Symmetry: D2
Subunit: 206 residues, 4 copies
């Protein structure tokens, strides 16, 4: 609880007065040598130059954290981002797409049984989910307020006043803004924002 | 106050168990029936027809497979029990079944709830129009969930030392006495020598 | 020669369709019933009781959801149609449902078969004690599958220009005339103006 | 003539096994590596970078979990093995993983194939843009499948009495000698005293 301010990987999703969004932040202790990279309609969490090797030491440190498929934004702390986005692309409602992926992928097999978390949002709805050694949960994001979840400590949706009017601001906020400023070991962050004219990506370093 | 269908699962000083209770307004003409290693919620004599009016009112609410007890408010009881029987951990068996079956397509989008318990662990789950949830039942305390209102696990001091008592308790005992429209209930208890079934009417 | 429950799906010069036929030995006291956008296989008057003896004899064999027709030999018809209704491509909808429901737990491990078809594509699938299979129906030709013997898609020249004809054909027409113990059949046809239902008795 | 990634599974007079072979044109700079109870297909020194160009070229092709051997052409090897480890029959473990993972999103929609074998049974499966298939491997004979051309189980007289021989055979032996672009292979054999791993280069 209280003295444990290290949430590990964090993601937020929802809508505010300026538009819809998904934010993601990498918090790490054992692998801080990483950054976010923007590529065609996706943001990848990858090793910074010199540490390419790391992906061979740990299979959970490199993955697309954000995938944009049509009007849908997908965010997750691992390779399941692709699993989910692909299902949405091929036609599958958000809840099931997240549910099926997490159920199959399951929690990560590391020394902490690190959970797999994810969220997806489109024009009319948004869902957030997590899978751990103790269970599986996927739930509708209340339209009334953005929420966030992490792999450690905050392993269930938590309401948050996420103020941001662009992907750059969104990424900066989950990295240093509001309640997120208190969560330790920030490394890198990324976000996708949609003010109505489409999904835009952005990244932010410390 | 009207929770609709209710189920509880967990362990107490006397043993392990699953309890189930039918609460209904539109279909109160039902009872529980014990058959080989399962308890079915069925129409009382004269209303056989009902199953043809509504496809969610008749189903096995309890299935015993080996050392595992399965309880649910619908046909997914069989979907889950079958997977356990064929080898699948409780969490996934409940998760896969609920994900596929989904909430019931009635005027209320009535959720599908379920729980399963064996010698070492127990899980409880629910699927609704707003999501899916399957979670480990804390060994420290029994829990219960319903299709309406109490749509998330809630701790309960479930005192019972037999299937008969367990069934009677979810039907009229403790906090359950306040939940309206009781119709019928059933339960499975295991004091260590195996699963036993029982039913209780109002 | 006794294939048990049979279903066909595909397109011909007159339109798209799904046909279903009940072949039975132990439960021949059944018929098809048309209700809102679905066809149910149910007991004929006097045998309502049967559904309580065997849980696999009564179920919707056909469900129409928007531009999609779904057909299957069991309750998974609803599981699949619901997923399509909520947005899920045909292949996955059939795949997920069969994977979860699994083969029927009777003395024969009777397989669960299904097919779904819409404006652009169609899929057919089956799940048995030996595996799971879901595949794209070739646009070049209609196919059919059964719970016994013909447990894999088989091409068929399915001539029919209406649901009535389609139902009659899978019941007595072509190659289907040779399959024993026909009881009842139903079908859904779409000539471009929408899905229409029909049933045919012996 | 070019089958791409290939895997075989089954039993012969000497024991049980799973073999895997990487055939490639665009990425031939790879080898197999043995680590604790698993074999990984990885880039040879100097090409570490490749994994960042294509996400489907590096993955564990073989995982041993207890008495079970798992083989696949991609990261789903871990998805399947993990489910078996946590308790899930082989058919479902392969089915669920393939259904979720789906075919690879490359310029060829490269299928995901897999197989798993333990003391009593074995299953093989594949998922492609046209469908999903998981089926019981006949005990009477070993089978193999590939991502291209041979996209359905094919019987094979797989002679081998050790992991080394098994790996060598799928790489250059029998019918496999005719399949083009061999790069590296690996295998797991169980003569009754446990699973042993081995790799073979050209
Ligand atoms: N998703 C990630 O970026 C990630 N980074 C690390 N991990 C897992 O969590 C473990 C501990 O991470 P850390 O010590 O940075 O909190 C790592 O060893 C790995 O197994 C992840 N899931
Ligand atoms: N589980 C049950 O026994 C059950 N009984 C009814 N129902 C569904 O809930 C609806 C409302 O039931 P009630 O009026 O008992 O609250 C019914 O129309 C039906 O769709 C059930 N799922
Ligand atoms: N789908 C059906 O209509 C059906 N009817 C019967 N059955 C199952 O197959 C068994 C054998 O049926 P029959 O004797 O008609 O070949 C029945 O006892 C039951 O378990 C079915 N699946
Ligand atoms: N599993 C593998 O080893 C593998 N190697 C390559 N591939 C995918 O198949 C594509 C074509 O492979 P190739 O060019 O070797 O026939 C590659 O570009 C990649 O997308 C694989 N799945």
């Amino acid at each position: 609880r209280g003295s444990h301010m290290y949430l590990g990987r964090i993601l937020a999703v929802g809508r505010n007065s300026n538009g819809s969004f998904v934010a993601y932040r990498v918090s790490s202790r054992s692998f801080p040598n990483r950054t976010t990279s923007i590529q065609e309609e996706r943001v990848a969490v990858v090793p910074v130059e010199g540490h390419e090797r790391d992906v061979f030491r740990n299979p959970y440190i490199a993955y697309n954290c954000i995938r944009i498929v049509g009007d849908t934004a997908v965010v997750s702390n691992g390779s399941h981002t692709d699993t989910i986005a692909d299902k949405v692309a091929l036609g599958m409602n958000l809840r099931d797409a997240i549910g099926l992926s997490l159920l199959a992928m399951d929690y990560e097999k590391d020394e902490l049984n690190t959970p797999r978390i994810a969220a997806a949002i489109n024009g009319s709805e948004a869902f957030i989910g997590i899978v751990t050694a103790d269970g599986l949960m996927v739930s509708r994001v209340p339209e009334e307020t953005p929420v966030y979840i992490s792999t450690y400590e905050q392993t269930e949706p938590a309401a948050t006043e996420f103020k941001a009017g662009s992907p750059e601001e969104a990424a900066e906020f989950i990295l240093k803004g509001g309640e997120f400023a208190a969560f330790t070991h920030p490394v890198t962050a990324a976000a996708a924002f949609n003010d109505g004219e489409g999904w835009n990506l952005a990244t932010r370093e410390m």
